[PDB]
Structure formats: structure tokens, C-alpha cells
Design a protein around this ligand. Structure first.
Ligand SMILES: CCC(C)(C)C(=O)C(=O)N1CCCC[C@H]1C(=O)O[C@H](CCc1ccc(OC)c(OC)c1)c1cccc(OCC(=O)O)c1
Length: 128
């Protein structure tokens, strides 16, 4: 399924090149600009465990998710992944546990040692 496709085709966007965060650009966005540290970013996302089990979707709430980029306000794979995106881009991210919730998990929805899959659409971003 989609998580295995990221394993097979994803771009390694980690500084260490350890395959910890792999990315497929599903829809190329527009403009040259990517969001910068401290920007307010707006996304829609769907999250599942790598085995396909859904844990959350902002579409179900009709509620974009908003955060400040590059400040450790979200899991490492999101700060790394969203910084590579263009406005209007849709990507798939596969995140090894060390770039997600690691040993602690996010219990009960996310177990310890979980690889996570996210679909992310970068709706907008604005300087603080
Ligand atoms: C349980 C799964 C939830 C949390 C619902 C989920 O879908 C999810 O996994 N996320 C929500 C959308 C952004 C990615 C991801 C997320 O980062 O949520 C983070 C989880 C907490 C976290 C922050 C920083 C971290 O490292 C610097 C960190 O590492 C373990 C954990 C989160 C941020 C803000 C709000 C939030 O939940 C809603 C709330 O508390 O109101 C969850």
C-alpha cells in the first residue's frame, strides 16, 4: 500500500541520510518558496501506522492543523518534512520511530517503536 510505496520510492530528506524520514511528492506545489523557521504553517493531514491503521485526520474535523515550523512543536519528521514543501504540495512521509514517538509512543493511539505514515498538504504559510 501507500506506506510500502514510500519505502520503495521515497526521497531520504534526513541530514544523516539514515532513511529515517522518506518522502514522496504526490502533487508538486507552486512557487519557489518553502516555509522558514518560525513561520506559521497551515496543513491538512492524514496519519496512519505503517500497517495502515488510521489514527487521525484533520479532514474529518474540517480543521486545518496550524503550527510554528522548526521549533520542535511537532515530531522531528514533520519539522524536517514540512520545511521541504512548496505551497499546494501534497506529500507522503514515512517516519521511523526515532523521528516520531520513539520508545515512549503516543499512547494509546501510537505504540512504542512505531513507524508512521502521513499524507500532508501544505495549504499556506506566513512569516510570524
Ligand atoms: C495521537 C496522534 C496525533 C497526536 C493525534 C497526531 O495525529 C500526530 O501524530 N500529530 C499531530 C499533527 C502533527 C504531527 C503529529 C504531532 O507532532 O503531534 C504533536 C505531538 C506532541 C509532540 C510535539 C513535539 C515533539 O517533538 C519535538 C514530539 O515528539 C515525540 C511530540 C502535537 C502537537 C500539537 C498538538 C497535538 O495534539 C492536539 C492537542 O494537544 O491539542 C499534538
Amino acid at each position: 500500500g501507500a506506506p510500502a510505496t514510500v519505502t520503495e520510492q521515497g526521497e531520504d530528506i534526513t541530514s544523516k541520510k539514515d532513511r529515517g524520514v522518506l518522502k514522496i511528492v504526490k502533487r508538486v506545489g507552486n512557487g519557489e518558496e518553502t516555509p522558514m523557521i518560525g513561520d506559521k504553517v497551515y496543513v491538512h493531514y492524514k496519519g496512519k501506522l505503517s500497517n495502515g491503521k488510521k489514527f487521525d485526520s484533520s479532514h474529518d474535523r474540517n480543521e486545518p492543523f496550524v503550527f510554528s515550523l522548526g521549533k520542535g512543536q511537532v515530531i522531528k519528521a514533520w519539522d524536517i518534512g514540512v520545511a521541504t514543501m512548496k505551497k499546494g504540495e501534497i506529500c507522503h512521509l514515512l517516519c521511523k520511530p526515532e523521528y516520531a514517538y520513539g520508545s515512549a509512543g503516543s499512547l494509546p493511539k501510537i505504540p512504542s517503536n512505531a513507524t508512521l505514515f502521513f499524507e500532508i498538504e501544505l495549504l499556506d504559510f506566513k512569516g510570524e
